[PDB]
Structure 1
């Protein structure tokens, strides 16, 4: 249960057993020492995603099971040529099968067989959600250049009409610059002009130019108020291949990014990235909870872990203050599988059953129950 795929609830206090949703998992953990053969037998009942997959596999394949939970290990790291954890229990002919989070790779596939991956898992970054500000070019956005150039040419031809007005009837001359200033002012709500002398064509002519100024200006304001609202989108980083990680010092005060040491992600990074691993070690962090707390207080700029755990953490976070650029840009995208015994005969059947689950569409339902959260929108 070190992963959010299987959970552990001790037992319903109503009937002394568990409901028909979970399956009884025997938490057979050696508690104190090897002084006695007592495995600390307390019958719990595990449930979740891997539990549902396992329960679907047994009905689609006729077999029974009994969950010997774990003893002295988490996933299995080769130490002195000896495997521990799930891989250690499988390789010693004591388990014959393993489930949960195995993160299939070459070292585990060397001595332990594997089925087809039922879920993807790689290396995804987790950053905070940058607030989306308005574009720097937005005032000159809600009106195309065509509208501006016509308005200008209409201003020019109305000035021509005003200079033609000079041959009107009997009723400081009304020059071209004065009319231009008067019409330039009348479209930006007012400056301080001196107007037509009289002459009903002149006053009328400025009055219908004012009616096109009132519509043009109450239409720009409406269009500006309709863009400012809808458009909002931004992205902090593009992934591990962006220049933000390859060149940390070539920026503003540099970013800070680190993972949990002594793991799989740290091992790959160190194997395929020297300077990246060095910079990550220069900013090492504690467990996933402490890493989330550090991301919440603005101390770390990017967290590095597996895709599934980070997605689950971001789905159920308080509000939606977390992001995971992730998605298509995930590095070393491995999968989780069911560690069958080496050279066993159930491997083909179990992988065919997994592919058949995949075929009809039940794993999507399982994901929508156990892998989505509040920020699914």
Structure 2
């Protein structure tokens, strides 16, 4: 029903639409088991709704107003709503989660640090055999490491061949391991603080969510400053948020886990992904809003658990939920040429040089 557009009765005339989907088919299956006829309507005020200045809105408000006995949809379940109204057994797991896109130490990983120690000990024995055959020993180790990177005579020749083979093998295995890499993400445990403190990262991280939503209420509940910062970052809709993500106007998006996951699976090209490899916060379920304790209740719950018992939920998830990005067969992508991991290994490489400088200074100290 809409107030501004009126053919007659001034708000009495209502527009008819066709609703269908996962939650719809679930509601039909449940209504099939419970065997009651029903009349479906759409909420004109807000999408989901929240409590402002002491007043409920949306579907919950329609339930408080007795305009609807049972509310079905993408509505999440939280502590505040469950007190006043009853919720059915959770249909699917959904909650506050972050969707992001990643743009981009493997060198030391391929050696597992064992190859380095083994080659160092073997080079020490070979350099001892070569020395048997002060700065001269340093030049011997310089020769060994010189062979290691590929820039008495027989031993050095065989050692050079083995070092060359080891180098080629190391190169092929490092390339293969670099190609086989995956799972790369940010904020594995959400405790990374990137989203927490904007000023810790320069430039500050831009993140927001759809206002008046459950994720927004939970966001204001757990974190005050996060709510204050994401207040200006609030997005009109999930589509506008996805566009803000794609065009670069937003770094990370905070939304429902199931919605974000379907959006990930049904994503063309599979550009955007969930954080923590499907990691969700608050771990809420999708229920069904209902009336005061007296009602169908346990019958509805038994019907949902029956729906889970038959296994039709898996098929429903296959049709309406599952995406083509699950077909990825474990590892999702290559990450291609851009790495920045080599820059990470550069620090480890530099550290041994700094320690060698410390040893040089320590040798200079013993001299003086």
Deviations 1:56-114 (A, max 9, x none): 11332222223234455544555787655433443444433221133233554454333
Contact 2:48/2:213 (8 A) holds in 1: no
Question: Larger relative CO (CA 8 A, sep 6+): 1 or 2?
Answer: 2
Structure 1 unaligned segments of length 5 or more: list them. 1-27, 132-136, 166-172, 191-201
| Equivalent-residue separation in structure 2 for 1:140 and 1:71 (angstroms) | 59
Q: 1:109 to 1:183 in 2, by over 3 A?
A: closer
Q: 1:351 to 1:29 in 2, by over 3 A?
A: farther
Tell me how far 1:278 sits from its aligned partner. 1.5
| Equivalent-residue separation in structure 2 for 1:322 and 1:231 (angstroms) | 18
Contact 1:126/1:322 (8 A) holds in 2: yes
Instruction: Specify the alignment match of 2:84 in structure 1.
Output: 111
Higher mean alpha-carbon deviation, 237-246 vs 77-86, is at: 77-86
Alignment of 1:32-111 (within 5 A): 32-33=5-6, 35-36=8-9, 40=13, 44-72=17-45, 74-77=47-50, 85-111=58-84
Structure 2 unaligned segments of length 5 or more: list them. 326-366
Q: TM-score, normalised by structure 1?
A: 0.69
Contact 1:340/1:346 (8 A) holds in 2: no
Q: TM-score, normalised by structure 2?
A: 0.71
Q: 1:359 to 1:160 in 2, by over 3 A?
A: closer
Q: 1:119 to 1:227 in 2, by over 3 A?
A: closer
RMSD between aligned alpha carbons? Answer: 6.4
**Larger proportion of strand:** 1
Contact 1:113/1:339 (8 A) holds in 2: yes
Contact 1:260/1:285 (8 A) holds in 2: yes
Instruction: Specify the alignment match of 1:221 in structure 2.
Output: 171
| Equivalent-residue separation in structure 2 for 1:242 and 1:101 (angstroms) | 29
Contact 2:208/2:252 (8 A) holds in 1: yes
Q: 1:249 to 1:39 in 2, by over 3 A?
A: same
Q: 1:251 to 1:34 in 2, by over 3 A?
A: same
Contact 1:31/1:40 (8 A) holds in 2: no
| Equivalent-residue separation in structure 2 for 1:203 and 1:107 (angstroms) | 81
Higher mean alpha-carbon deviation, 219-228 vs 288-297, is at: 219-228
Instruction: Specify the alignment match of 1:237 in structure 2.
Output: 187
Q: Residue 343 of structure 1: which of 293, 312, 315 is its match?
A: 293
The number of residue pairs the alignment matches comes to 327
Higher mean alpha-carbon deviation, 252-261 vs 88-97, is at: 88-97
Tell me how far 1:366 sits from its aligned partner. 1.5
Contact 1:130/1:235 (8 A) holds in 2: no
Instruction: Specify the alignment match of 1:179 in structure 2.
Output: 140
